Amino acid sequence: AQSGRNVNHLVFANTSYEILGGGKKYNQVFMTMDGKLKIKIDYTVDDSVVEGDYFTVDFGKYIHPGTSRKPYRVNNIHDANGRTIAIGSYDSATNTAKYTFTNYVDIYNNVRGSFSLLSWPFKELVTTDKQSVPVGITVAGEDYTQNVIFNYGNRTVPVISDINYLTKDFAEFTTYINQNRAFNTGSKVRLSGQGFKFTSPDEIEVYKVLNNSQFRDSFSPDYANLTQVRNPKIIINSDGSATVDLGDIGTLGYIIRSKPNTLPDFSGIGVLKSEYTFTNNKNQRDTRAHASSIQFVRAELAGFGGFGGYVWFDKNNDGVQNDSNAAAAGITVNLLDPTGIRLATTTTDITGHYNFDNLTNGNYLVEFVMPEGYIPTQANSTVDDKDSDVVFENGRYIAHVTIKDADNMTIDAGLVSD
Ligand SMILES: [K+]
Ligand SMILES: [K+]
Ligand SMILES: [K+]
Ligand SMILES: [K+]
Ligand SMILES: [K+]
């Protein structure tokens, strides 16, 4: 890995916020419409900054980068030609992004520009509709704060729901029942997804609510302080919908915390519909429903992957991995963007292997630095798990790799004397 230092003191950032979505005209982030908080950063970089140095963005107490999909990520920073200025990484433990300068800063001087991020509140802290919070962050060591109002549009109604968060494999959906605290009997809830399916009752948890304050407007309840119905009557239907029989709830509120699975190959507007059927305090049957929507493409939902490979001395010059005592240790491997900027570096270990992990989805070049007197062997001469993948292309010894939500791709290099 490329070494470097924290250069917050050499990068100057000017920051502003912009509220996006339907609440902009009300100066509010409308969390269940299309709302998010856009962070806009203008930055300058001193000439003394070098490849591997980095600046940080501390997102502080109330917000994180990204929106619905976890784990959260940040994108790389590019110039107008698409060249990578800095690679972006995010650590959830410190709620901080790290922007590590590439060799861009060793080609170009007076580096400066702008980038932006989308951000969302921690729903366990920003709990309440119309709540103003001091959104204080630090960008390259420069503090910025502004008060921002969030609104989830919670309503005191028999049934309402939201998607709490989304992951590669499942979403967590929150269904609130009887916030209106009507006397209800014969209460049942049917959960039906598009782009999502249930397989098992253990994917659904049911909680009683005695105090309305526990119905967080953010739809991310403090479950540790709610009594769980640990034996709930749940049926998974043949179509992958689920029915929850709550029984005679009386005036109690209920929360259903569900984790439907994302469907393989799904691409579009996913939906979970919560349909609540019950007998009201007039002894009349009633049916009410609420549906929550989320755009996703399952195949790229993680947003990152990784790859690695193997370097060896191709002792019989055939381009095949059929050579003994041949692993090449200490070979430098550089990861480049398509413009030729170096994003990362590593070296093969004693076993001949290298890898790059936690790589944002996209197209990369993989460059192998030749030991003195060596060149790549014949490329692509056999089956793709036993060949050498490196060619001389555009002045470099490289292979191409595309990262898309997988870490099983391999890129190997066989070496022969020149
Ligand atoms: K600074
Ligand atoms: K420099
Ligand atoms: K060989
Ligand atoms: K290969
Ligand atoms: K190949």
Q: What domains are there in the chain, each with its CATH number?
A: 1-152 (2.60.40.1280), 153-300 (2.60.40.1290), 301-418 (2.60.40.10)
Beta strands in 167-223 (DSSP E): 171-177, 185-194, 196-197, 204-209
What tokens appear for 68 in the block?
């619905």
Determine the length of the chain.
418
Token digits for 24? 């902009």
- Give the separation between CA 330 and CA 374, rounded to whole angstroms: 14
Q: Which of 364, 345, 374, 365 is nearest to 403 (CA)?
A: 364
Cis peptide before 71 (omega within 30 of 0): yes
- Residue whose token pair is 């912009």: 18
103 Cα to the center of ligand 2, angstroms: 8
Q: How far apart are CA 395 and CA 342, in angstroms?
A: 14
- Are 313 and 373 a contacting pair, CB within 8 Å? no
Cβ-Cβ contacts under 8 Å for 75 (sequence gap 6 or more): 88, 117, 360
Number of helical (H) and strand (E) elements in the chain, helices listed first: 1, 33
| Ligand showing the shortest atom-to-Cα distance for residue 320 | 3
Q: Compute the distance from residue 17 Cα to the ligand 1 centre, in Å.
A: 18
User: Tokens in use for 127?
Assistant: 């709990």
Angstrom distance (rounded) from CA 173 to CA 166: 9
Ligand nearest to the CA of 313: 3
Closest by CA to 291, choosing from 276, 305, 272, is 272
Q: Which residues contact 24 (CB under 8 A, 6 or more apart)?
A: none
Kindly give the distance from the C-alpha atom of residue 314 to the centroid of ligand 5, in angstroms, as a whole number. Answer: 15
- Cβ atoms within 10 Å of 212's Cβ, excluding its own: 11
For 139, how many CA atoms within 13 A lie in the half-sphere containing its CB? 22
Distance CA 67, CA 327 (A): 44
Q: How far is it, in rounded angstroms, from Cα 141 to Cα 221?
A: 34
Q: Ligand 1 centre from 12 Cα, in Å?
A: 4
Q: How far apart are CA 175 and CA 219, in angstroms?
A: 8
CB-CB contact of 183 with 158 (8 Å):
no
The Cα–Cα gap between 264 and 196 comes to 9
User: If we measure between CA atoms, which residue out of 118, 116, 145 comes closest to residue 132?
Assistant: 145
Short-list 166, 123, 176, CA closest to 270: 166
Residue 252 to residue 248: CA distance in whole angstroms: 9
Alpha-carbon distances of 41 from 1, 8, 45, 116, rounded to whole Å: 27, 14, 13, 6
Using CA atoms, how far residue 160 sits from 2, 222, 349, in Å, is: 50, 17, 55
291 closest CA partner among 170, 194, 148: 194
Q: Bridge partners of 289? A: 275
Across 348-387, the runs of DSSP E, i.e. the strands, are: 353-360, 362-368, 374-376
CA-based diameter of the chain, in Å? 91
Q: Give the residue from 261, 302, 310 showing the smallest Cα distance to 406.
A: 302
Cα–Cα distance for residue pair 390/366, rounded to 1 Å: 8
Q: Are 205 and 257 in contact (CB under 8 A)?
A: yes
**Distance separating alpha carbons of residues 68 and 72, to the nearest angstrom:** 9
Place of tokens 């030749």: 370
How many CA atoms lie within 13 Å of 154's alpha carbon, on the beta-carbon side?
26
Cα–Cα dist 258/199, whole Å: 11
Q: Determine the distance separating the centroid of ligand 4 and the alpha carbon of 385, expressed in angstroms.
A: 5
Question: Which method was used?
Answer: X-ray
Gap from CA of 254 to ligand 3 centroid (Å) = 66
Q: Resolution to 1 decimal, in Å?
A: 1.5
Quick count: other Cβ atoms within 10 Å of Cβ 275?
18
Q: Which ligand is nearest to the CA of 12?
A: 1
Nearest ligand to the CA of 139 is 1
How many CB atoms lie under 10 A from the CB of residue 285? 9
Rounded CA-CA distance 146/62 in Å is: 12
∠ CA 91-92-98, nearest 5°, is 25
Strands 63-65, 112-121: pairing is antiparallel
Q: How far is CA 58 from the centre of its chain?
A: 17
